[PDB]
């Protein structure tokens, strides 16, 4: 299969909700080395969001059971071993994505929009490793923090405060501060400024992106309200 065939098979897999097939198609598209179009970029992001998402969801359930069964020895060991199995899958998925970002996506991102998208993505998949990492953690946390910080600097300089990629990055960096670093105030401060800056310049909303923009602002405020 050539690029166009793999992209078409990815769209079919998406419709069929076969996200492993979708991810394999887009992985192959990325390994051809050419810069991804906006469409291909979104197909890659959606595919892996769902592939890693099923493992993160399974991990959270099994971890909660493993915690809930402290007094039931047999059942807790069963839960622990299964959580570890899920973790190996989750790590392999994150390592696959971060390898694509480092080998192809980040070096070929010619425009600011793309660079911010892929650095945020790097920040995100290092954050998923950090969610399950328990001595390797500090290094993983630092790699997520460095990707997010670089993306944040470029977005504040090159993008309008209502751009969905700029808002989304502020949302996920904010989640990183709260969940991974346990800095609720630093998380709240980031989400609040992101929200207020966007409210002050709503005239900069594009018809092709206003739905994602307004959605992320609602999410930014939800996190601010929940962490307060």
């Amino acid at each position: 299969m050539d690029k166009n065939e793999l992209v078409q098979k990815a769209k079919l897999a998406e419709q069929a909700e076969r996200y492993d097939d979708m991810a394999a198609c887009m992985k192959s598209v990325t390994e051809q080395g050419a810069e991804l179009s906006n469409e291909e970029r979104n197909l890659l992001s959606v595919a892996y969001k769902n592939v890693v998402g099923a493992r993160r969801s399974s991990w959270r359930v099994v971890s909660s059971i493993e915690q809930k069964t402290e007094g039931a020895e047999k059942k807790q060991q069963m839960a622990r071993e299964y959580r570890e199995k899920i973790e190996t899958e989750l790590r392999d998925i994150c390592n696959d994505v971060l390898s694509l970002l480092e080998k192809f996506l980040i070096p070929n991102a010619s425009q600011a929009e793309s660079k911010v998208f892929y650095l945020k993505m790097k920040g995100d998949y290092y954050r998923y490793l950090a969610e399950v990492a328990a001595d390797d953690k500090k290094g993983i946390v630092d790699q997520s923090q460095q990707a997010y910080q670089e993306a944040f600097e470029i977005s504040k300089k090159e993008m309008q405060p209502t751009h969905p990629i700029r808002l989304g990055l502020a949302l996920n960096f904010s989640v990183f501060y709260y969940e991974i670093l346990n800095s609720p105030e630093k998380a709240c401060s980031l989400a609040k400024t992101a929200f207020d800056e966007a409210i002050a310049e709503l005239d900069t909303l594009s018809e092709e992106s206003y739905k994602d923009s307004t959605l992320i602002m609602q999410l930014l405020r939800d996190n601010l309200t929940l962490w307060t």
């Binding site: 808002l167 709260y178 969940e179 992320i216 999410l219 996190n223």
Partner: peptide, 6 residues
């Protein structure tokens, strides 16, 4: 946990 985007 705390919702992210996408």
């Amino acid at each position: 946990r705390s919702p992210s985007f996408p």
